[PDB]
């Protein structure tokens, strides 16, 4: 997803979601030690 | 003023088949007989497994009104694999555009969906069948290897067609490149000689076409209507097409050089949402040997006396001059909501004076909205802005409005009385009508 | 009987070549019961803005507690005509145009009426909260056909004759025109009736869109005050059409869309601070001449009338009826108002 041909028209916005992304899991800054 | 409304030659097709959506004349000089040509985009056919294909019924004038459908095609859907149809001919609106040279017939289908080769899809590319005497061919330059909504997948090729005087076919696809539009020109001398009944994407050596533009031009609808005529003195006809949603729905009209498809002149509308370029017809209305442009804007809203707006329509007349300029004049409709300027067709010389003539139709005008056609006469100055004759439809609306005046044709004498004639199609009641131009005598008291 | 437009009726006799006159006074009232309807575009492009409809429930009703005696709201959605080439006709895509992106998009629909006008704001919030988006292919979208359907169907939507009918059309793109339907085989002009059978627009797929003139006539006939709320650059497109559409307002929605309640309330104030008239004359030879007398005394031509009106402020229209040729009546009405003056012109030849 997100790599098929350049979609213009009404589908242009929808084309961008489910794009390959990152899932970050880190500790909060306020709970280090 | 000489067209005879006392004895109109009648015609009729099947009920509910849109008989008369497109009309023309057939004059094969070899056989020296005269035939009409009427399209029925909603007609049923003999094709197996196809419902509502479309028919182009060839109707005769010489006292026999027998309309025999031209067998442009008889088969059904060709297939890619087992139970994998390649094309979908059902509801294809075949015959919505009929154009005839002396010995050729070109009827196109704009709503012909097909299963693209790469993946199972339904792309309305459209196709055309060019019958040249005995040989019959298929013409479909918008179904290619590079198609999608991005490409010319939605081309709807064959929405508008015309013949150049130099044996070329000008084809207009409104929907390609996300509805920017496209024009395609190609010569018949190559359409016939390049047709393998087992090949779909055919490359034509001497084809001319217009390419992709920036994304701000979407929904322009270039090719919504085409016409031809010489406009830069070379002698070769030049491609005039109407793009009725350009410039924030103002409407524009483009003129392309007929030798290399290079832009020459532009027009532009003056009101938003007026459909400037809906109809285009290039004739020679003042008799100065220079072709003159006509442009239709059926939805133009015009200020009333009190200030209230009225949607009456407008036709723009633009007289070509020898230096590259255009002397433009406006011309407004007569009844509100009548869509004056829907159809424009040159008439030749309807009264044989020396200046060609023209006729403009208001399909939804008239009493009880049956339809009205107006007849204009040229002069040495230009068009004469008061219509000499008013042609009115005689048919009531059965389910939908009769739409008398949606399509019309002229400039060919079928009686051979010396004067050109006119056929009109009131497709909302599945009828076509032929009118005859009476000879004109000059009494010098 | 009439309270805001006086006189409500006039009987006059004229003879050819003569001119008469009278005075027509329009006094706007203090507070108006307001009926607002959200004709919302729910196409795929409008997906980021449907979620911003959950704030307009109570906030706006608080903003409009002083400008109105009571308040009502409604909902409704449109995308486009459901035929090729506007939607895809693939059997997988025909009922969910988003399927190639794994979305739970709702099946496309010409226009669906959702919630008839109600004073229960919790109902409006509930109706809005459960709403999904749809999709199609073309860049423009069929908004004008939905506008006509919402304007004409009266007892379905639930308009009040005693109210100040308002109609908000939330979109972000240009709309389809009348003759754009020829690409889809729709060559039947719109008839101007409305065809909601089960709160779904049945005839979206058989007759084409309305034109600007027909849309404007249907809007002004039903006393509808349209407030466009466009978001992208197409606000300018919706703005340049205002001269062609009397009695319509266009606001701009910023990217943050925090300016929606303010958009509605400022548009309503600008709407209530204006008076203008037109005449629907269907008699032969009689020409009406109307010059408006503003509270600042300006001699405006009346067709756009006097602006910047408030209450405690009566606006007077100077009329001049002519009698040019012989062979009914004419009704002169302030656009947006609920009362009309019926000039029962007698003619004797
Ligand atoms: C009648 O009316 C029509 C329509 O209004 C008009 O046609 C339009 O013509 C113009 C000009 O020919 C077209 O606009 C572009 O023209 C440039 C020409 O390049 C030179 O001129 C520009 C002017 O500023 C300079 O900036 C440029 O550096 C050059 O000096 C073309 O290069 C354009 O092609 C672009 O599109 C191609 C396909 O997408 C690209 O492959 C190409 O590289 C160009 O891309 C550019 O723009 C992209 C935008 O995103 C950008 O990403 C790229 O990086 C690059 O910058 C283009 O042709 C316009 O498209 C025409 N419109 C239509 C509908 O045909 C007629 O000229 C007019 N005729 C008369 C007689 O009035
Ligand atoms: C062409 O023939 C077909 C049938 O072969 C007709 O299809 C009819 O369509 C209507 C509505 O779509 C149905 O109610 C009928 O049941 C269909 N007919 C049959 C026999 O099933 C179609 O109407 C015909 N076209 C024209 C223009 O007459
Ligand atoms: C206004 O509408 C809300 C719903 O949007 C109504 O609240 C519901 O009331 C019923 C009882 O009749 C409960 O079963 C529901 O759970 C309530 N829903 C919510 C979301 O609270 C409310 O009753 C309506 N107002 C009036 C006066 O009836
Ligand atoms: C136009 O609106 C006014 C006020 O918005 C309406 O006047 C009300 O009429 C109802 C009965 O129709 C009365 O019960 C109210 O007391 C009136 N209110 C005021 C403030 O006068 C008027 O009826 C409306 N006219 C039409 C034709 O609908
Ligand atoms: C309202 O319009 C009438 C005309 O219908 C005006 O009457 C004219 O007033 C001028 C000013 O003295 C006279 O010269 C004319 O003879 C009057 N009659 C006509 C037919 O012009 C009247 O003055 C206007 N009132 C206002 C306040 O503008
Ligand atoms: C097309 O042909 C005309 C004919 O003279 C010429 O003027 C024009 O420059 C040509 N355009 C291109 C792109 O070759
Ligand atoms: C209307 O009145 C103005 C001045 O009050 C005048 O100039 C105009 O000619 C009049 N028009 C008609 C149609 O009476
Ligand atoms: C509108 O009315 C208010 C109050 O009467 C006044 O302050 C303001 O100046 C007026 N606007 C114009 C443009 O005169
Ligand atoms: Ca040329
Ligand atoms: Ca000329
Ligand atoms: Ca002549
Ligand atoms: Ca003849
Ligand atoms: Ca759309
Ligand atoms: Mg959209």
From Swiss-Prot, chain B:
Residues the record lists as binding Ca(2+) 3: 349, 351, 353, 355, 357
Annotated Ca(2+) 1 binding sites: 230, 232, 234, 236, 238
Residues bound to Ca(2+) 4: 413, 415, 417, 419, 421
Annotated FG-GAP repeat ranges: 2-68, 79-140, 143-195, 207-261, 262-327, 328-385, 389-445
Binding residues for Ca(2+) 2: 284, 286, 288, 290, 292
Localization, UniProt: Cell membrane; Cell junction, Focal adhesion
Family: Belongs to the integrin alpha chain family.
Quaternary structure, from the entry: Heterodimer of an alpha and a beta subunit. The alpha subunit is composed of a heavy and a light chain linked by a disulfide bond. Alpha-V (ITGAV) associates with either beta-1 (ITGB1), beta-3 (ITGB3), beta-5 (ITGB5), beta-6 (ITGB6) or beta-8 (ITGB8). Interacts with CIB1. Interacts with RAB25. Integrins ITGAV:ITGB3 and ITGAV:ITGB5 interact with FBLN5 (via N-terminus). ITGAV:ITGB3 and ITGAV:ITGB5 interact with CCN3. ITGAV:ITGB3 interacts with ADGRA2. ITGAV:ITGB3 interacts with FGF2; it is likely that FGF2 can simultaneously bind ITGAV:ITGB3 and FGF receptors. ITGAV:ITGB3 interacts with IL1B.
Function: The alpha-V (ITGAV) integrins are receptors for vitronectin, cytotactin, fibronectin, fibrinogen, laminin, matrix metalloproteinase-2, osteopontin, osteomodulin, prothrombin, thrombospondin and vWF. They recognize the sequence R-G-D in a wide array of ligands. ITGAV:ITGB3 binds to fractalkine (CX3CL1) and may act as its coreceptor in CX3CR1-dependent fractalkine signaling. ITGAV:ITGB3 binds to NRG1 (via EGF domain) and this binding is essential for NRG1-ERBB signaling. ITGAV:ITGB3 binds to FGF1 and this binding is essential for FGF1 signaling.
Further comment: The constitutive activation of ITGAV:ITGB3 on neoplastic cells may contribute to tumor growth and metastatic potential.
Annotated protein name in UniProt: Integrin alpha-V
Species assigned in the record: Homo sapiens
Designated gene of the protein: ITGAV
Residues of the full protein shown: 31 to 475 of 1048
UniProtKB/Swiss-Prot annotation, chain C:
Residues of the VWFA domain: 33-271
Compartment(s): Cell membrane
Tissue distribution of the protein: Placenta, kidney, brain, ovary, uterus and in several transformed cells. Transiently expressed in 293 human embryonic kidney cells.
Disulfide bonds listed in the record: 98-105, 153-194, 294-306, 326-349
Origin: domain of life: Eukaryota
Positions of Ca(2+) binding: 80, 136, 138, 140-141
Chain positions recorded as Mg(2+) binding sites: 41, 43, 141
Residues with attached carbohydrate: 120, 289, 308, 318, 338, 348
Comment block on domains: The VWFA domain (or beta I domain) contains two cation-binding sites: the ligand-associated metal ion-binding site (LIMBS or SyMBS) and the metal ion-dependent adhesion site (MIDAS). Unlike in the other beta integrins, the cation-binding site adjacent MIDAS site (ADMIDAS) in ITGB8 is not functional due to the presence of two Asn residues instead of 2 Asp residues. This domain is also part of the ligand-binding site.
Family designation: Belongs to the integrin beta chain family.
Subunit architecture: Heterodimer of an alpha and a beta subunit. Beta-8 (ITGB8) associates with alpha-V (ITGAV) to form ITGAV:ITGB8. ITGAV:ITGB8 interacts with TGFB1.
Function: Integrin alpha-V:beta-8 (ITGAV:ITGB8) is a receptor for fibronectin. It recognizes the sequence R-G-D in its ligands. Integrin alpha-V:beta-6 (ITGAV:ITGB6) mediates R-G-D-dependent release of transforming growth factor beta-1 (TGF-beta-1) from regulatory Latency-associated peptide (LAP), thereby playing a key role in TGF-beta-1 activation on the surface of activated regulatory T-cells (Tregs). Required during vasculogenesis.
Protein known as: Integrin beta-8
Stretch of the intact protein here: 114 to 467 of 769
């Amino acid at each position: 997803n997100g790599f098929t041909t350049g979609r213009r028209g009404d589908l242009a916005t929808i084309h961008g979601m489910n794009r390959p992304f990152l899932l970050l899991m880190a500790t909060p800054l306020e709970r280090a030690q | 003023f000489n067209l005879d409304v006392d004895s109109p030659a009648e015609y009729s097709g099947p009920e509910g088949s849109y008989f008369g959506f497109a009309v023309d004349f057939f004059v094969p000089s070899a056989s020296s007989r005269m035939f009409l040509l009427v399209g029925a985009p909603k007609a049923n056919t003999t094709q197996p497994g196809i419902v509502e294909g479309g028919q182009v019924l060839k109707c005769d004038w010489s006292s026999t009104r027998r309309c025999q459908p031209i067998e442009f095609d008889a088969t059904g859907n060709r297939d890619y694999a087992k139970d994998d149809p390649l094309e979908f001919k059902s509801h294809q609106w075949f015959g919505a555009s009929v154009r005839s040279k002396q010995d050729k017939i070109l009827a196109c289908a704009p709503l012909y969906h097909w299963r693209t080769e790469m993946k199972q899809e339904r792309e309305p590319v459209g196709t055309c069948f060019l019958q040249d005497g005995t040989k019959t061919v298929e013409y479909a330059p918008c179904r290619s290897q590079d198609i999608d909504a991005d490409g010319q997948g939605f081309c709807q090729g064959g929405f508008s067609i015309d013949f150049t005087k130099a044996d070329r076919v000008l084809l207009g696809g409104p929907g390609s490149f996300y509805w920017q539009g496209q024009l395609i020109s190609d010569q018949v001398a190559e359409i016939v000689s390049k047709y393998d009944p087992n090949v779909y994407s055919i490359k034509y050596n001497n084809q001319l076409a217009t390419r992709t533009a920036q994304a701000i031009f979407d929904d322009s609808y270039l090719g919504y209507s085409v016409a031809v005529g010489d406009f830069n003195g070379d002698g070769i006809d030049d491609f005039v097409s109407g793009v009725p949603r350009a410039a924030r729905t103002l409407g524009m009209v483009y003129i392309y050089d007929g030798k290399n498809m290079s832009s020459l002149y532009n027009f532009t509308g003056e009101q938003m949402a007026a459909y400037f370029g809906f109809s285009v017809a290039a004739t020679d209305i003042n008799g100065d040997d220079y072709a003159d442009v006509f442009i239709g804007a059926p939805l133009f809203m015009d200020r009333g006396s009190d200030g209230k707006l009225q949607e009456v329509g407008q036709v723009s007349v633009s007289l070509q001059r020898a230096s590259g300029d255009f002397q433009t004049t406006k011309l407004n409709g007569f009844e509100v909501f009548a869509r004056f300027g829907s159809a424009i067709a040159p008439l030749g010389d309807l009264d044989q004076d020396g200046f060609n003539d023209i006729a403009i139709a208001a399909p939804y005008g008239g009493e009880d909205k049956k339809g009205i056609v107006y007849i204009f006469n040229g002069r040495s100055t230009g068009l004469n802005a008061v219509p000499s004759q008013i042609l009115e439809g005689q048919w009531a609306a059965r389910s939908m409005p009769p739409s008398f005046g949606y399509s019309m044709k002229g400039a060919t004498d079928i009686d051979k009385n010396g004067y050109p004639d006119l056929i009109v199609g009131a497709f909302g009641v599945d009828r076509a009508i032929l009118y005859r131009a009476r000879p004109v005598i000059t009494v010098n008291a | 009987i009439n309270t805001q437009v006086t006189p409500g009726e006039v009987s006059i006799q004229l003879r050819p070549g003569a001119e008469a006159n009278f005075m027509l006074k329009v006094h706007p009232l203090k507070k108006y019961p307001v009926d607002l309807y959200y004709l919302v575009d729910v196409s795929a492009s409008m997906h980021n803005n449907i979620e911003k409809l959950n704030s307009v429930g109570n906030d706006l009703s608080r903003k409009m507690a002083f400008f109105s005696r009571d308040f009502r709201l409604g909902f409704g959605s449109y995308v486009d005509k459901t035929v090729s080439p506007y939607i895809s006709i693939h059997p997988e895509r025909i009922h969910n145009q988003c399927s190639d992106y794994n979305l739970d998009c709702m099946p496309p629909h010409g226009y669906i009426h959702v919630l008839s006008l109600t004073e229960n704001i919790t109902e409006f919030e509930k109706a809005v909260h459960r709403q999904k988006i749809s999709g199609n292919i073309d860049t423009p979208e069929g908004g004008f056909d939905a506008m006509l359907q919402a304007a004409v169907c009266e007892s379905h939507i639930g308009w009040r004759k005693e109210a100040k009918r308002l109609l908000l059309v939330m979109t972000d793109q240009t709309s389809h025109l009348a003759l754009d339907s020829k690409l889809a085989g729709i060559v039947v002009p719109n008839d101007g009736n409305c065809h909601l059978k089960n709160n779904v627009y049945v005839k979206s797929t058989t007759m084409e869109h309305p034109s600007l003139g027909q849309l404007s006539e249907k809007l002004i006939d039903n006393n509808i005050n349209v407030i466009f709320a466009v978001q992208g650059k197409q606000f300018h497109w919706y703005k340049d059409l205002l001269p062609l559409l009397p009695g319509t307002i266009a606001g701009e929605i910023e990217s943050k869309a925090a300016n929606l309640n303010n958009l509605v309330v400022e548009a309503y104030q600008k709407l209530i601070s204006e008076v203008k008239v037109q005449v629907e004359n269907q008699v032969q030879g009689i020409y009406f001449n109307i010059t408006a007398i503003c509270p600042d005394g300006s001699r405006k031509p009346g067709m756009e009338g006097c602006r910047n009106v408030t209450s405690n402020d009566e606006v007077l229209f100077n009329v001049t009826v002519t009698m040019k040729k012989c062979d009914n009546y004419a009704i002169i009405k302030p656009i947006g108002f609920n009362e009309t003056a019926k000039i029962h012109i007698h003619r004797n030849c």
